[PDB]
């Protein structure tokens, strides 16, 4: 009973100094390919630069999805075959320390980014593009291996039906927590 439109949070992981990383990994025999992707992540931070999540394809494939902060503006950058595609919320800033929910959406070449209730950014292509994200290997929450570890909090991370962080707080066999990451509970 999850919904992409419903708030993705409330499994509140703190990513403090020294960096942290939570990683979900699909079994090599069941890495999904998708024509459409829906990411929703609830977070809070003050950082100027960080990489929150990145979905990477198997080896020898260039398909990936990267959600990151750059100059306090949240944005996405992905590749499904052709070339890198970029979309970013520049109208404003999100590193003000309060809770936000950034949604990203992909339909083949089509893409979507919204920060809360702000104006949905739309990125349409002037020509048909490839439509499939081939065999997804890992979800890498943290951005440590990218040399821009994220610092702050994440209450939830929904990815194509998956409640990634909730699954981590359930010690799910696929989740691997590594680094400065605490599962701040309640009360």
């Amino acid at each position: 009973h999850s919904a992409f439109a419903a708030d993705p949070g409330h499994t509140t992981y703190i990513f403090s100094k020294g960096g942290g990383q939570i990683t979900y990994k699909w079994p090599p025999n069941d890495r999904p390919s998708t024509r459409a992707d829906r990411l929703a992540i609830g977070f809070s931070t003050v950082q100027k630069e960080a990489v929150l999540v990145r979905v990477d394809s198997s080896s020898g494939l260039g398909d990936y999805l990267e959600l990151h902060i750059h100059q306090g503006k949240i944005g996405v950058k992905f590749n499904v075959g052709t070339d890198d595609i970029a979309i970013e919320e520049s109208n404003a800033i999100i590193n003000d320390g309060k809770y936000h929910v950034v949604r990203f959406t992909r339909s083949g070449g089509n893409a979507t980014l919204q920060v809360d209730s702000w104006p949905v950014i739309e990125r349409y292509p002037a020509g048909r593009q490839l439509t499939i994200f081939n065999s997804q290997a890992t979800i890498i929450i943290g951005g440590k291996e990218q040399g821009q570890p994220f610092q702050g909090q994440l209450s939830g991370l929904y990815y194509n039906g998956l409640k990634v962080l909730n699954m981590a707080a359930e010690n799910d066999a696929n989740i691997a927590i590594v680094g400065n990451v605490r599962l701040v509970g309640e009360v």
């Binding site: 090599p28 025999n29 999904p32 390919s33 020898g60 075959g81 490839l130 499939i132 081939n134 065999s135």
Partner: protein, 536 residues
């Protein structure tokens, strides 16, 4: 009496015990309607869900098959499985009873003495013109492997594949039928004890083609999870129809229609008695098909070669393979009681072949050169071997490899086999290796029973073992997407390694099973890498 309740009503099966006292009997539900009859206004339209009934429905006999004509028709002997061509008397009997209302599937459910079983759905197909799922008894496979086996009937030939390249008739009706069948299965097989998240679709010949085609389609998203294509791909010359409008027009003309507007064309055919449509003879180019799957920008969004090349298909567990001497029928009639081929007929064969497949001399020369044994180029037995290998390599081996290369390249668990044993009949020359369709009885576990009317071979003791090996591999794949996991082979170091473009490991399947690399690497690379450089 065995009864199941489905979203449409209650159905009563029938019990069946096998001619083998090691296998527990099965309950079979025969002639289960998975869709409303595609008749009248629903002709040349996608299939609709079946109507429900407030009744106990008897599913104890096969329903009539989809209209076809296997006697006075053309009968593409090269496309068809050898076991089918060789006794169409026994085949005819399965098809004596026909109806346009023919959208029925058959379920084979094992018998215990805990947990939803895998479902193996079999798609048949010779040339898209003929056949039934009913020809394939899923009993032994279901009983031996503890999986549910379904065999499906979908619209065939004109009724299943007529296309104008327009919105008048969009085509692919038979493919949509298979989708619908898989829908019904996905949402109704739980009631039989099946597992909707572990459905494996499988087929041989044009059945394989269907399997592959379905994996390129965004319609089969979430309906099945693994696929086995046997001697069949989506990249062979007779996989899809590239000129449907032309043949719709010729058919329309042949039955007295106004071929003017395409809407008036379909409207005309919409109304004719199906027999008129079926009894008509529309001959396509040599190694091509007239009525078959079509690139419709929907079910099949584009040329399979392009889609596959670009990775525009989802992740599935894939198993595919070829037989040693698939192209028996290409050579059979050109042989000369001495079991050999003249250097004269050879040149013809190859020249004609390249003509039909490629057109309007460096290529013709190159292929003649490549398929000549320059050690004894006068050996007329050798000449039939390499001639047969040319057709087998072109129509089957190279497309399978290309398919395996492209699925594995894009992350899909891939397993590749080469079938190198068969049960020789008196119906086939003694020099013939595994022909097209010869894996089937093993997969269907026919040796476990011994000769049937359909497969009348005197299965040896080794045939029974092979079948058990094959069936374990197939059902292991159906269970886990790995032909090795659960049931083991009792094949020590003989583990079916996963295929990838690096070593291209495949399983040599025969009385001396082994795992080799780069199957027929020389010819495959000829056709896949070198032959393209000789085009304009």
């Amino acid at each position: 009496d065995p009864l199941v309740t489905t979203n449409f009503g209650k159905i009563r099966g029938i019990k069946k015990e096998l001619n083998n006292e090691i296998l527990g009997p099965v309950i079979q539900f025969l002639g289960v309607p998975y869709a409303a009859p595609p008749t009248g206004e629903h002709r040349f339209q996608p299939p609709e869900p079946p109507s429900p009934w407030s009744d106990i429905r008897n599913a104890t006999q096969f329903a009539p098959v989809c209209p076809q004509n296997i006697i006075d028709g053309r009968l593409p002997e090269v496309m068809l499985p050898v076991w089918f061509t060789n006794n169409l008397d026994v085949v005819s009997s399965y098809v004596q009873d026909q109806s346009e209302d023919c959208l029925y599937l058959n379920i084979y459910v094992p018998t215990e003495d805990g947990g939803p079983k895998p479902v193996m759905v079999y798609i048949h197909g010779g040339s898209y013109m003929e056949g039934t799922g009913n020809l394939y008894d899923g009993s032994v496979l279901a009983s031996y492997g503890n999986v549910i086996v379904i065999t499906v009937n979908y619209r065939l030939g004109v009724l299943g594949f007529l296309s104008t390249g327009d919105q008048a008739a969009k085509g692919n009706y038979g493919l949509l039928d298979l989708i619908q069948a898989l829908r019904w299965t996905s949402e109704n097989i739980g009631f039989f004890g099946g597992d909707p998240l572990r459905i494996t679709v499988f087929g041989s010949g044009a059945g394989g083609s269907c399997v592959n085609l379905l994996t390129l389609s965004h319609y089969s998203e979430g309906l099945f999870q693994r696929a086995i294509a046997q001697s069949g791909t989506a990249l062979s010359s007779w996989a899809v129809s590239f000129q449907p409008a032309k043949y719709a027009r010729i058919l329309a003309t042949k039955v007295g229609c106004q071929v003017s507007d395409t809407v008036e064309l379909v409207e005309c055919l919409q109304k004719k008695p199906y027999k008129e449509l079926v009894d008509q003879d529309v001959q396509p180019a040599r190694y091509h098909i007239a009525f078959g799957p079509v690139i419709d920008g929907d079910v099949i969004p584009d040329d399979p070669q392009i889609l596959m090349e670009q990775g525009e298909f989802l992740n599935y567990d894939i198993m595919l393979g070829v037989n040693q001497g698939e192209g028996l029928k290409f050579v059979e009639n050109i042989v000369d009681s001495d079991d050999g081929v003249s250097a004269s007929d050879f040149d013809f064969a190859v020249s004609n072949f390249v003509d039909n497949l490629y057109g309007y001399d460096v290529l013709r020369e190159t292929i003649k050169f490549m398929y000549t044994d320059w050690a004894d180029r006068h050996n007329p037995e050798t000449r039939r071997k390499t001639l047969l290998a040319l057709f087998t390599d072109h129509q089957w081996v190279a497309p399978a490899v290309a398919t395996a290369d492209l699925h594995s390249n894009f992350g899909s668990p891939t397993y590749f086999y080469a079938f190198y044993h068969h049960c020789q009949t008196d119906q086939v020359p003694a020099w013939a290796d595994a022909a097209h369709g010869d894996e089937v009885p093993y997969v269907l576990g026919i040796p476990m029973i011994g000769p049937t009317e359909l497969f009348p071979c005197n299965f040896s003791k080794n045939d029974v073992m092979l079948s058990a090996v094959v069936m374990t591999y197939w059902t292991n794949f159906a269970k886990t997407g790995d032909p090795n996991q659960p049931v083991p082979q009792d094949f020590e170091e003989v583990a079916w390694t996963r295929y990838s473009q690096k070593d291209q490991l495949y399983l040599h399947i025969g009385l001396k099973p082994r795992v080799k690399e780069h199957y027929r690497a020389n010819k495959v690379n000829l056709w896949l890498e070198l032959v393209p450089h000789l085009h304009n």
